[PDB]
């Protein structure tokens, strides 16, 4: 009976400020943080459970991390993917507000090795399509 569009927000954007955060929570550790996310990638849904999930995994990489970080996205169709890896000892309960949120979205937070030397964190949303009812 009624389509409509869901709220698109571009990421890019929503984690550069968030970044700078960051940078200033942990300049005295020297901690580097560098993102790669084009344009067109873009989440759907509550933009402030983005940026809530997105500040709890991108804080606790920041701890963990010995000076480096990396940021990267790849969009599906129904799933937004969100890849943040350090390189601080890795991965061979803090996420949880992260595990939380993305509940909600029909995702999942998942763990792995990273190239860079640490920890890989996937963090993948759901219910990605831009239309409703
Ligand atoms: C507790 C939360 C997420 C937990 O469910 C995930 C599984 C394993 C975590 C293993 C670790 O060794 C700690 C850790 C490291 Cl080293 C890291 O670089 C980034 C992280 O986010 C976590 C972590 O522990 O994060």
Known sequence: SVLLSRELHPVAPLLDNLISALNKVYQRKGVNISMDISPEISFVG???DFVE???????????????FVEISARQTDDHLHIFVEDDGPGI???????????????????????????????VVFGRQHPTQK
């Not at 999930?53 to 000076?67: F, H, I, Q, R, S």
């Not at 507000?97 to 996937?122: F, H, K, N, P, W």
């Open 46 to 48: 509550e933009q402030n």
């Open 92 to 122: 061979p309960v803090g996420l949880a507000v992260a595990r939380e949120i993305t509940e909600q979205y029909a995702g999942q937070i998942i763990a792995s090795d990273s190239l860079l030397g640490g920890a890989r964190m996937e």
């Open 53 to 67: 999930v997105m500040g709890n995994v991108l804080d606790n990489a920041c701890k963990y991390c010995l000076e």
